[PDB]
Amino acid sequence: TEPHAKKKSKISASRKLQLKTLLLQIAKQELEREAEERRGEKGRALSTRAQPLELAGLGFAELQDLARQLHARVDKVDEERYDIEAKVTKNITEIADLTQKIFDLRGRISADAMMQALLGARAKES
Amino acid sequence: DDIYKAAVEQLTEEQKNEFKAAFDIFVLGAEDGSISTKELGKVMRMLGQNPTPEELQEMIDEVDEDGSGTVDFDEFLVMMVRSMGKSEEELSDLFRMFDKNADGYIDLEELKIMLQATGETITEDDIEELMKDGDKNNDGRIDYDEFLEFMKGVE
Amino acid sequence: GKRQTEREKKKKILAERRKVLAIDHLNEDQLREKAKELWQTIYNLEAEKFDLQEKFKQQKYEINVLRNRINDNQ
C-alpha cells in the first residue's frame, strides 16, 4: 500500500465530543420518555383486558358461580401468558447464539514517565 | 480516536513544545524526519522496555493516519495522550433511540433529527462531519459496531 | 417429535402453577373478597403478559440488528 491523505474535519474534535455528549443525553431522555409512554400503554391495555368486577346485587349462589368463573379465567390467562413466555424464551436462545456468532466474526510506559526520562528537568508542563 | 484528538487540541503550547523536544530524540538520524519501528524500538529499549517487532508495528499502526508506516509529530501527540465511557449494553439501548425506522442503521435524517433535538445550533458541517466520523465503511450510515466506536469514551 | 414434548411440558408447568379453589365454607362477604382476590390474580397475569409482549418486540428488533451485523461482517 501507498500513503494517503489524513482525514481532515471542518469542525474540531472538541466540538464533535460536545455534540456526541449531548446526543447521548437526548437519547437517554427519549429512553425515559419511551418507558413512561409504555407505562401509560400498559394501564390502558389492562383497563380493557381486566375490567372491574360488578359485585353489587349478586346473591350467595351468584357469588359462588362468579368465583368459579374467575378461577377458570385465571387458568386461561395463565395459558396465554405461558405461550408468549415460550416465544420470549426461544428468542433468548437465538439472541445468545447470534451474540456469540458476531463476537467471533468481529474477533507500556506512560507519557509522564517517558517525558521525565528523556528530558529530565526540561519536563515541567508535561 | 475522537476523545484523544480532543485532548491533543487542548494541550498548551508549552506542553506541545516539550513533546516536540521528546519527538526530536526519537527521530534523531531518521531519513524522513519520522518515527519508524527502528527509532521506536531504539527508544523503547533505551527506556528499559523490550517490545517485539510486532508490538512495535502495532504501536505505530494505532496512530498512523496517512498509512506511512511511520509516526510524524501530529501522530506522536496522539500517541502521547493515548498513553495516559458507557457499557455496550447501555449503548445498545441508546442506539435503538437513534434508529427511528427500526432498520438497524442510523441514517443522515435520523442523525439530523437527533442533533436538532439537542438545542445546540446545528450547522450543515456539524451533520456531515459527524456522519463521516461515524461511518467507517462509506455506506453513509452508522451501523451498530460503528456506533460503539463512534461513542467510545463518551460520557 | 419436539411438539409433543413442548405440549406435555406446557401441561406440566400449568398444572404445577394451578391453585385449588375451595369456597364451600365461605359466606357472602368472604365470597366477595375471594372474587376480588381472583380478579387481582387475573390482573397480575395480564400485566405479566403485557411485559412479555413488550419484551418480545424489543427482542425482534435486537435479533434483526444481530442478523444485519452478521451479514455485514461475513
Ligand SMILES: [Ca+2]
Ligand atoms: Ca504516519
Ligand SMILES: [Ca+2]
Ligand atoms: Ca434507521
Ligand SMILES: [Ca+2]
Ligand atoms: Ca457505515
